[PDB]
Design a protein around this ligand. Structure first.
Ligand SMILES: *[C@@H]1O[C@H](CO[C@@H]2O[C@@H](C)[C@@H](O)[C@@H](O)[C@@H]2O)[C@@H](O[C@@H]2O[C@H](CO)[C@@H](O[C@@H]3O[C@H](CO)[C@@H](O)[C@H](O[C@H]4O[C@H](CO)[C@@H](O)[C@H](O)[C@@H]4O)[C@@H]3O)[C@H](O)[C@H]2NC(C)=O)[C@H](O)[C@H]1NC(C)=O
Ligand SMILES: *[C@@H]1O[C@H](CO[C@@H]2O[C@@H](C)[C@@H](O)[C@@H](O)[C@@H]2O)[C@@H](O[C@@H]2O[C@H](CO)[C@@H](O)[C@H](O)[C@H]2NC(C)=O)[C@H](O)[C@H]1NC(C)=O
Ligand code: NAG
Ligand code: NAG
Ligand code: NAG
Ligand code: NAG
Lengths: 189, 189
């Protein structure tokens, strides 16, 4: 189920091989071995890393180049779902003390999600699944709100062949600042 | 496990026993045997049916009465997350052909969700988990968008001791009329 069935016998057609840790040797396509602590699946919805596309089709559509120097293109309006007038749907909301948040990316960032939200809801590309220890994604962090503060709160638009429709929180201070001023604390999962 | 530890040695204290298929014999508290196909946990969080409350405390807080005639109290503003001005966060959005949706409730209803969203994201009470085939919840329906239509789309507020923060779709005609007119089609899960 790694690749759509149509992509056989040669699913890696068009992909330049860099390092055999990664699918078709390309880190953008995520790891062969997936981090054993994100399950991603249930009986109703499964994680199709490329959607119904084959790997090279997926890179051509969602990156600037299928070649290794291509980079992923991200959605407009900070990835918020768009209303019928093409405006992102969100509002300023207060996060309460005790709430559990997680994040893919460095603490220089400003985007969090609720702890544990399934991957396919986040519309993140495959390379966010790369790991260093097999347990967890290499850029995955978990936090707890320690003092109430206001964020932009709203639904996640579909992208990268994923359905999206989780909720995301866009902070007005980066995570490092929020930790330093006592709004968030780090938790190790 | 099923009940918080402090609730022992008599966790069903205060619950009137009706039928031994249900926890403490109360259908409002959901099935002893949970439907073996349905996604409760999200990725890293497990499903606590009562949160940290004991059963009788849970019904006192979330229902009109602990007695068997008590009915669940639902959140204001259709259960949308509220902004800092106490207004629901949402906008009108066009659902696209091909989108997969599901719903807990009769087709006389107006609320739908992305197919497969984890139960803990929906802020629904435990009795929506009651199952007669043991496989799927009794009131559970799956649909696919066959023609575009506009819904109210937004995040789900925490309620019933659950974290919420899935996305919900509120239709302007009940689900039945969307099916009859070719906007949705029924699917067997
Ligand atoms: C998102 O969309 C909903 C629903 O709008 C309906 O569905 C859409 C898919 C689309 O087809 C729309 O064309 C369609 O209206 C919006 O909710 C509705 O908002 C209207 C007004 O904006 C409400 O109508 C009001 O109803 C009142 C009684 O319940 C009544 O007092 C009002 O009458 C007055 O106003 C009219 C002019 O608007 C005037 O002619 C009258 O004589 C009188 O002065 C008014 O009719 C609906 O009740 C709302 N429907 C629901 C289900 O709530 C929603 O505003 C929109 N949201 C965003 C953010 O765009
Ligand atoms: C949500 O807030 C942002 C940012 O405003 C800051 O945070 C809020 C919680 C509130 O306390 C504000 O007073 C703070 O300044 C709003 O974006 C701002 O919009 C104004 C309007 O032109 C603009 O001058 C600022 O530069 C914007 N700031 C940023 C960081 O973009 C946003 O409009 C608010 N959304 C609402 C109220 O729905
Ligand atoms: C890249 O490939 C080399 C094999 O020469 C391997 O040692 C290394 O671990 C790979 N990089 C990873 C897994 O990040
Ligand atoms: C990326 O590499 C390909 C060659 O493999 C080249 O065609 C393309 O122009 C490159 N883009 C750059 C260097 O920005
Ligand atoms: C309880 O309810 C189920 C279905 O609602 C029914 O099959 C059963 O006979 C009822 N009574 C008992 C004692 O189980
Ligand atoms: C439910 O019935 C009980 C009798 O067992 C009664 O005390 C109570 O008033 C009823 N519920 C409400 C909300 O009135």
């Amino acid at each position: 189920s790694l690749f759509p069935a149509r992509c056989w016998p040669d699913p890696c057609a068009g992909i330049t091989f860099q390092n055999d840790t990664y699918v078709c040797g390309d880190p953008r396509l995520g790891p062969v071995v997936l981090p054993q602590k994100f399950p991603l699946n249930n009986e109703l919805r499964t994680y199709a890393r490329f959607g119904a596309l084959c790997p090279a089709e997926f890179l051509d559509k969602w990156a600037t180049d299928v070649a290794p120097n291509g980079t992923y293109i991200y959605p407009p309006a900070n990835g918020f779902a768009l209303d019928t007038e093409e405006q992102p749907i969100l509002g300023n909301a207060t996060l309460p003390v005790g709430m559990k948040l997680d994040r893919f990316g460095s603490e220089y960032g400003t985007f969090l999600a609720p702890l544990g939200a399934p991957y396919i809801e986040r519309s993140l590309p495959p390379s966010n699944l790369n790991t260093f220890d097999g347990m967890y994604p290499y850029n995955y962090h978990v936090y707890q709100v320690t003092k109430e503060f206001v964020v932009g709160l709203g639904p996640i638009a579909p992208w990268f062949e994923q359905p999206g429709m989780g909720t995301q929180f866009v902070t007005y201070t980066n995570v490092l600042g929020l930790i330093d001023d006592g709004y968030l604390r780090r938790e190790d999962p």
